[PDB]
Design an enzyme around this catalytic site. Structure first.
Site, PDB file in Angstrom:
ATOM      1  N   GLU A  77       9.715 -23.009  22.812  1.00  0.00           N
ATOM      2  CA  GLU A  77      11.122 -23.038  22.449  1.00  0.00           C
ATOM      3  C   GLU A  77      11.876 -23.940  23.352  1.00  0.00           C
ATOM      4  OE1 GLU A  77      12.264 -21.345  19.448  1.00  0.00           O
ATOM      5  OE2 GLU A  77      10.069 -21.520  19.430  1.00  0.00           O
ATOM      6  N   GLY A 133      24.337 -23.849  18.013  1.00  0.00           N
ATOM      7  CA  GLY A 133      23.422 -24.411  18.997  1.00  0.00           C
ATOM      8  C   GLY A 133      22.085 -23.703  19.093  1.00  0.00           C
ATOM      9  N   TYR A 166      15.189 -20.918   7.217  1.00  0.00           N
ATOM     10  CA  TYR A 166      14.065 -21.781   6.903  1.00  0.00           C
ATOM     11  C   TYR A 166      13.531 -21.357   5.567  1.00  0.00           C
ATOM     12  CZ  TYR A 166      14.335 -22.997  11.822  1.00  0.00           C
ATOM     13  OH  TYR A 166      14.774 -23.415  13.057  1.00  0.00           O
ATOM     14  N   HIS A 173       3.228 -22.211  19.872  1.00  0.00           N
ATOM     15  CA  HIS A 173       2.941 -21.723  18.531  1.00  0.00           C
ATOM     16  C   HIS A 173       3.071 -22.821  17.477  1.00  0.00           C
ATOM     17  CE1 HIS A 173       7.032 -20.943  19.617  1.00  0.00           C
ATOM     18  NE2 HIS A 173       7.392 -21.062  18.350  1.00  0.00           N
ATOM     19  N   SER A 197      15.762 -17.341  12.172  1.00  0.00           N
ATOM     20  CA  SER A 197      15.369 -17.576  13.544  1.00  0.00           C
ATOM     21  C   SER A 197      16.543 -17.877  14.491  1.00  0.00           C
ATOM     22  CB  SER A 197      14.391 -18.746  13.562  1.00  0.00           C
ATOM     23  OG  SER A 197      13.866 -18.971  14.856  1.00  0.00           O
ATOM     24  N   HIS A 229       4.575 -26.202  19.580  1.00  0.00           N
ATOM     25  CA  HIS A 229       5.744 -26.308  20.403  1.00  0.00           C
ATOM     26  C   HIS A 229       6.037 -25.007  21.093  1.00  0.00           C
ATOM     27  CE1 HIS A 229       7.479 -24.237  16.888  1.00  0.00           C
ATOM     28  NE2 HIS A 229       8.431 -23.828  17.705  1.00  0.00           N
TER      29      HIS A 229
HETATM   30 ZN   LIG Z   1       9.367 -22.005  17.551  1.00  0.00          ZN
END
Ligand SMILES: [Zn+2]
Ligand SMILES: CN(C)CCc1ccc(C2CCN(CCc3cnn(-c4nccc5c(=O)[nH]cnc45)c3)CC2)cc1
Ligand SMILES: [Zn+2]
EC number: 1.14.11.66
Length: 340
Positions: A177, A157, A164, A263, A275, A175
Site C-alpha cells: 500500500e 486521497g 472497483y 499482494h 477499498s 504491490h
Molecule cells: Zn492493494
C-alpha cells in the site's frame, strides 16, 4: 514468532459483539499472528449488511475505466493501462457479462487460475477501477470503509473510499500500500476476487526477484513495484523460492492487507469491491521507513505528526536522522496487549 509461524492466510469469523469495534478486532487478529501472512480474511456476522440493495447503482459513473493490456511470457508480465471515456455501471455490466468478456466455464478454482495465467495477454479486459465513492449506507457504524476512525485520520486521497468494478481477468499487480499502510477491501457483490500474498518478512526477497527481472525499471525508480504494472505468476514465485499464499475472496467478505504485505490477484467476473487504507500504531515505523516511488509526481504522507504524537521520545533523534530502528515483521501492534 510463536503466533502463526507458517505465515498462512488466516480467516476470521467475529460475532456481532467482536465485530462492532473495528480497531480492536485488527489488534485481536494481530495477537493471533494474522499480519505475518500479510493478508487476512474476515467473514462478517450474517446479520450484518452494509447496504440493503445494490439495485439503484446502474447510473453510477465510472469516470476512468482502464483497458488492461498485458505483455509478457513464462510467468513475467507488464500491464499497461489505457484510460477509456467515462461509463456507467449498467454499460460496464453489459460488457463484463457479454460473450467476449464473460468468465470461461470451469469446474474448480485451480482450472480458472490456469485459464487466467494462460490467457492474461489476450482479449484485454476493462477495469472500472479507482472510483471515488462508497456503497455503504449512512447509518452503518460497523466497519464503515468511508469512516473507519483509525489514527490515519490525523493526516486530513488515501483516507477516502474507492470502488472497483471488475470483470473476468481484470487484475491488480504486485504491490504494497501507499506509505506501506494497511488496506481494507470489501467485496460488495458479484464474482470472487482471487488474491496472492507474500509475507512481509519475505517482501525484500520479492523486490530482489523483481529487480533482477526488470533491471531497466529498477534503475529508473527504486520503488518500481509501486507503479502497479508487474505481474509475476505463482509458478515463477515457486521457481525462485519466494514464499506466498493464495486465497479467494467471495461476496460479503473483507480482506485486510498489512504493512509491507505484497499482494496481487484477479477478478473472476463482474463484481464490485470497496477499498481504503488505514493505520495502527505499528504502521508508524513502516511509514517512516517506506521506499517511495521517485520518478512519478505520488502518495507521500509527512510522518512528523505521527512521530510527534506516538513516538515523542524518538522525534528529535529521528528528525536528526539517528533512528537506526530495525522493524520486526512478526511483532503484533501495541494495541494487541489486552489479547496477550
Ligand atoms: Zn492493494
Ligand atoms: C490511491 N489508489 C489506490 C490504489 C490501490 C492500492 N491497492 N490497490 C488494490 N489493492 C488490493 C486489491 C485491489 C483490487 O482488487 N483492485 C485494484 N486495486 C487493488 C489499489 C491509487
Ligand atoms: Zn516510480
Amino acid at each position: 514468532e510463536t503466533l502463526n509461524p507458517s505465515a498462512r492466510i488466516m480467516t476470521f469469523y467475529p460475532t456481532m459483539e467482536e465485530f462492532r469495534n473495528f480497531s480492536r478486532y485488527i489488534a485481536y487478529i494481530e495477537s493471533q499472528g494474522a499480519h505475518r501472512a500479510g493478508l487476512a480474511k474476515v467473514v462478517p456476522p450474517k446479520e450484518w449488511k452494509p447496504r440493503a440493495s445494490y439495485d439503484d447503482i446502474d447510473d453510477l459513473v465510472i469516470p476512468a475505466p482502464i483497458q488492461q493490456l498485458v505483455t509478457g511470457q513464462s510467468g513475467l508480465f507488464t500491464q499497461y493501462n489505457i484510460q477509456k471515456k467515462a461509463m456507467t455501471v449498467r454499460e460496464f455490466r453489459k460488457i463484463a457479462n457479454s460473450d467476449k468478456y464473460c468468465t470461461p466455464r470451469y469446474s474448480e478454482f485451480e482450472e480458472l487460475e490456469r485459464k487466467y495465467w494462460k490467457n492474461l495477454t489476450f482479449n484485454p479486459p476493462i477495469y472500472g477501477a479507482d472510483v471515488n465513492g462508497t456503497l455503504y449506507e449512512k447509518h452503518v457504524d460497523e466497519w464503515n470503509i468511508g469512516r473507519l476512525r483509525t489514527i490515519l485520520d490525523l493526516v486530513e486521497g488515501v483516507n477516502t473510499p474507492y470502488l472497483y468494478f471488475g470483470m473476468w481477468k481484470t487484475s491488480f499487480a504486485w504491490h504494497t500500500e501507499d506509505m506501506d499502510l494497511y488496506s481494507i477491501n470489501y467485496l460488495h457483490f458479484g464474482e470472487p476476487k482471487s488474491w496472492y500474498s507474500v509475507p512481509p518478512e519475505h517482501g525484500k526477497r520479492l523486490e530482489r526477484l523483481a529487480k533482477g527481472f526488470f533491471p531497466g525499471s529498477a534503475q529508473s525508480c527504486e520503488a518500481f513495484l509501486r507503479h502497479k504494472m508487474t505481474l509475476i505468476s505463482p509458478l515463477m514465485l515457486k521457481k525462485y523460492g519466494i514464499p506466498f499464499d493464495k486465497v479467494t475472496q467471495e461476496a460479503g467478505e473483507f480482506m485486510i492487507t498489512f504493512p509491507y504485505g505484497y499482494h496481487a490477484g484477479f477478478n473472476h467476473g463482474f463484481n464490485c469491491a470497496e477499498s481504503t487504507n488505514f493505520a495502527t500504531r505499528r504502521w508508524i515505523e513502516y511509514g517512516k521507513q517506506a521506499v517511495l516511488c521517485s520518478c512519478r509526481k505520488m502518495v507521500k504522507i509527512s510522518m512528523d505528526v505521527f512521530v510527534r504524537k506516538f513516538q515523542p521520545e524518538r522525534y528529535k533523534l529521528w528528525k536528526a536522522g539517528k533512528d537506526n530502528t530495525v522493524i520486526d515483521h512478526t511483532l503484533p501492534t501495541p494495541e494487541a496487549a489486552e489479547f496477550l
